[PDB]
């Protein structure tokens, strides 16, 4: 049974802020990692962590009219080798 976040979408945005929502997988989530970077340049990525119980995340410090890519990982503590770290990714653009 997969342990990958699903149904990632952009709830609401402003020229400087995203507000995203995903849906939890099947297994227990020890925390969700938000990794976001502008299109093409992976190296300039910024990542932060929220605890496994929250369903949405705010993202501040964005440039207007810019394409960004957003990836959400989930890490499950209860299974050391039964399950792994998965991620879902989409793209979006600030006005």
């Amino acid at each position: 049974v997969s342990d990958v976040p699903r149904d990632l979408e952009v709830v609401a945005a402003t020229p400087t802020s995203l507000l995203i929502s995903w849906d939890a997988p099947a297994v227990t989530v020890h925390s969700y990692h938000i990794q976001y970077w502008p299109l093409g340049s992976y190296q300039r990525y910024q990542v932060f962590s929220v605890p496994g119980s929250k369903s949405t995340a705010t993202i501040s410090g964005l440039k207007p009219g810019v394409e960004y890519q957003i990836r959400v990982y989930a890490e499950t503590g209860g299974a050391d080798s039964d399950q792994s770290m998965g991620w879902i990714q989409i793209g979006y653009r600030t006005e």
């Binding site: 997969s2 990958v4 699903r6 990632l8 979408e9 952009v10 709830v11 609401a12 945005a13 990692h33 990794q35 970077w37 299109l39 093409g40 992976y42 190296q43 990525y45 990542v47 394409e67 890519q69 998965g86 879902i88 990714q89 989409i90 793209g91 979006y92 653009r93």
Partner: protein
């Protein structure tokens, strides 16, 4: 009449206009006959639909007579038929909204989010040009490090299309293989992006290289990484390798030569988690040129025996082709020739030569 497509999360606009370019009564209705919004003069009164909060219209555009409909933060569930309502005639606009997302090493899965009843086809080309055709869900089973740039997925419905871009990064120290094909004189670049977790672990590593000759069982540089700082311990005299100081592991060869060829191993160890990290790397080098009468194209390095070398101008046919590593033409014809080292489907190395006599 009209059909409009849209990217998930974008903003699109369904422009309706009438005869009188002024302020006159008009409204918008959906397929279910629900009022989308209303207007009392210049000000906007909100419609009863659940999209009222998200959807909006431009009050400013009332002068020109245009009655736009704006849907910020497009979702899949907006695809529908919409009716512009002036009493003389109603213009209907049909709307389908798609979205692209990537689920789940050496393999990745792409899932395309689609509205109901749609019948769409989905092309996607790699940064290196690899053309992958598919339906609702696309699966990329075999990936190599070279195919780790920006992939472009173009979605097509009956005749209308929408274009999406998605970045793909291939993890270095997973099972994915690394190979680089260069003609002589081009600089070679190797990148080994690591997972974000291991950036703060810190550790040390080196690369060993073996050429055609059994003499060079081991060689190449040794280096130490702490925080996001890459510092080399020792560098080989023969290649003038340049390793990037910044955290993404960047290694450069000034230009490719035959002696700089053969399989190599990159080993990274780290005191944090004490798990031996290995990485396989190959470099294949082509030289294609004509000296005096003779014309020659040969390739050096570790190549699968199956692939084939050919000398040919694309106008005419292959003057010579063999399954060997070296191909040579004698007293060659005038023209714009080519050397192709190639697989069954695709060409691995293409060089364009032109002979003068």
């Amino acid at each position: 009449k009209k059909v409009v497509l849209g990217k998930k999360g974008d903003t699109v606009e369904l422009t309706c206009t009438a005869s009188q370019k002024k302020s006159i009564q008009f409204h918008w209705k959906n397929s279910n006959q629900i009022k989308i919004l209303g207007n009392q003069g210049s000000f906007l009164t909100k419609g009863p639909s659940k999209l009222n909060d998200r959807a909006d219209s431009r009050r400013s555009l009332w002068d020109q007579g245009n009655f736009p409909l704006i849907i910020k933060n497009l979702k899949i569930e907006d695809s529908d038929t919409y009716i512009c309502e002036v009493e003389d005639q109603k213009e209907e606009v049909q709307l389908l909204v798609f979205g692209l997302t990537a689920n789940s090493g050496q393999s990745l899965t792409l899932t395309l989010e689609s509205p109901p009843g749609s019948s769409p086809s989905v092309q996607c080309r790699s940064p290196r040009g690899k053309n992958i055709q598919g339906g609702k869900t696309l699966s990329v089973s075999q990936l190599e490090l070279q195919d780790s740039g920006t992939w472009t997925c173009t979605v097509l419905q009956n005749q209308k299309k929408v274009e999406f871009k998605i970045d793909i990064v291939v993890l270095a120290f997973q099972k994915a293989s690394s190979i680089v094909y260069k003609k002589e004189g081009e600089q070679v670049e190797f990148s080994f992006p690591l997972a974000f977790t291991v950036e703060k672990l810190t550790g040390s590593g080196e690369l060993w290289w073996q050429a055609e000759r059994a003499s060079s069982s081991k060689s190449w540089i040794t280096f130490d990484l702490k925080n996001k700082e890459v510092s080399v311990k020792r560098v080989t005299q023969d290649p003038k390798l340049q390793m990037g100081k910044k955290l993404p592991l960047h290694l450069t060869l000034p230009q490719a030569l035959p002696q700089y060829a053969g399989s190599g191993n990159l080993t990274l160890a780290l005191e944090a988690k004490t798990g031996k990290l290995h990485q396989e790397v190959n470099l294949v080098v082509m030289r294609a040129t004509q000296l005096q009468k003779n014309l020659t194209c040969e390739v050096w390095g570790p190549t699968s025996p199956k692939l084939m070398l050919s000398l040919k101008l694309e106008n005419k046919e292959a003057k010579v082709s063999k399954r060997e590593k070296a191909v040579w033409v004698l007293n060659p014809e005038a023209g714009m020739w080519q050397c192709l080292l190639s697989d069954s489907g695709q060409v691995l190395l293409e060089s364009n030569i032109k002979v003068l006599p």
